[PDB]
């Protein structure tokens, strides 16, 4: 018949191949596919969902829901501060964003942060959310944070301020610090201490390349 010759690589088993497997049940006709709501057709559709970020993950507040609560209400030290990289960062590593990114080695994109102020409807104050570029040093004072990139987020007007942090990739990252511009002004009836929740997702579109095994499972 047809003169063939076997190349190197014949009769081997490469684990990652896409060959036509001989079906064991050829007569068998499988169940018709009904429409089930909520189909996933790409993994980065999970990273685009906001989810609460445990910023207050100090040594004794990680097995309770006090990890997600940023206490608001000393103006010389910032409220909170954390590395801006969903990998190798205690704050952003178990987020939906930060968890679908540990399956991969090469990823690059932007990340948006939402700060939901969960205080009273009568509490009013200002917070200054500064961003440091990935090479720059953190601001040690509020003035030095004001001279860089910032957003004076008035709580009394809007209760949710959204960022979009670019240049986020691995293959020395940014900082999202927050400062007391003003204290929390409160009438006699409302409580004095409030909380701020944080969120994180992919801002516009996210790029991600090399699949690997996750470090978390043992």
């Amino acid at each position: 018949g047809v003169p063939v010759l076997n190349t190197p690589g014949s009769n081997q088993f490469l684990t990652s191949d896409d060959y036509q497997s001989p079906s064991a049940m050829p007569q068998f006709d499988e169940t018709p596919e009904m429409h089930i709501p909520g189909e996933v057709r790409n993994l980065m559709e999970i990273a685009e969902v906001d989810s609460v970020v445990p910023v207050n993950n100090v040594t004794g507040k990680t097995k309770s829901m006090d990890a997600y609560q940023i206490p608001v209400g000393d103006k010389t030290k910032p409220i909170f501060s954390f590395q801006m990289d969903p990998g190798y960062s205690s704050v952003l590593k178990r987020t939906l964003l930060g968890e679908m990114l540990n399956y991969y080695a090469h990823w690059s994109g932007s990340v948006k942060l939402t700060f939901l102020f969960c205080g009273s409807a009568m509490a009013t104050g200002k917070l200054l959310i500064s961003y440091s570029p990935p090479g720059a040093s953190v601001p040690t004072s509020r003035k030095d944070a004001m001279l860089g990139t910032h957003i004076v987020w008035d709580i009394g007007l809007q209760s949710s301020c959204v960022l979009c942090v670019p240049w986020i990739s691995q293959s020395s990252a940014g900082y999202i610090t927050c400062w007391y511009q003003t204290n929390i002004v409160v009438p006699p009836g409302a409580p004095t201490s409030c909380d701020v929740l944080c969120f994180a997702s992919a801002c516009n579109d996210f790029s991600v390349r090399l699949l690997r095994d996750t470090p978390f499972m043992a």
């Binding site: 932007s110 090479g135 990139t149 942090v165 240049w167």
Partner: protein, 238 residues
């Protein structure tokens, strides 16, 4: 005679060797957005003049960070951790009519140099002294520093066939000026300007300087760099 000016820096010049036949250009995304300074940065940064005697073996500068203390370029290196530029490099020699000699003005992208005594490394301050040049040597040297012997410039290659790179000969018989344009050769569109040395301007005298007992005992070589099309990362939010 053409009196070039860029910004607030004017030099006086007397053909351009465009490196690899390309002129530098900008990178053209909302996930990563570059900032184009344009203002300043592009002015001429004249380094310290270098005296070339009869016994000078050569010199080398390592860019982009040879300009790390040169005004706004040298200052934008500290605020942005990514960047790229083009670096028009003028090299005059303003010798006399009775001096003789010849120079190789070559740029050598990615000049990974070797240690003087192998089995060890050098303390990182031996490759570069910002503005001032590290000279070569006429013979072999030892110690924890760069093997700076000519005939094996820095990389273990022959120094004669170093002409494969963007080069220009300065034969004092004919000409005195050289100009090279190096359109940012790198494998990644942007890179940090303190870790990576994009190219190594090395000036190597093939024919040695010679003169009689009346002339000046040296010939000052003037180096001028104009960072063109420098662009950096973005510092603003999106």
């Amino acid at each position: 005679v053409r009196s070039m000016t860029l910004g607030n820096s004017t030099i006086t010049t007397q053909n351009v060797v465009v490196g690899y036949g390309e002129w530098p250009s900008y990178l053209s995304t909302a996930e990563d957005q570059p900032t184009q300074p344009d203002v300043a940065t592009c002015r001429f940064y004249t380094l310290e003049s270098v005296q070339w005697e009869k016994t000078s073996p050569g010199w080398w500068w390592k860019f982009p960070e040879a300009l790390k203390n040169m005004g706004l370029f040298g200052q934008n290196m500290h605020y942005h951790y990514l960047g790229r530029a083009g670096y028009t490099i003028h090299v005059q020699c303003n010798a006399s009519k009775f001096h003789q000699g010849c120079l190789l003005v070559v740029c050598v992208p990615e000049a990974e140099m070797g240690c003087a005594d192998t089995d060890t490394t050098f303390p990182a301050t031996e490759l570069t002294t910002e503005d001032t040049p590290h000279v070569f040597t006429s013979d072999s040297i030892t110690g924890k520093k760069v093997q700076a012997a000519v005939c094996n410039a820095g990389m273990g290659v022959g120094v004669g066939n170093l002409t494969i790179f963007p080069h220009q000969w300065i034969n004092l018989r004919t000409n005195n000026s050289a100009t090279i344009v190096i359109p940012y050769i790198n494998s990644v569109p942007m890179d940090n300007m303190f870790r990576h040395y994009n190219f190594t301007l090395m000036i190597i005298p093939f024919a040695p300087l010679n003169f009689t007992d009346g002339a000046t005992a040296y010939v000052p070589i003037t180096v001028t760099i104009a960072p063109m099309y420098a662009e950096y990362n973005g510092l603003r939010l999106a």
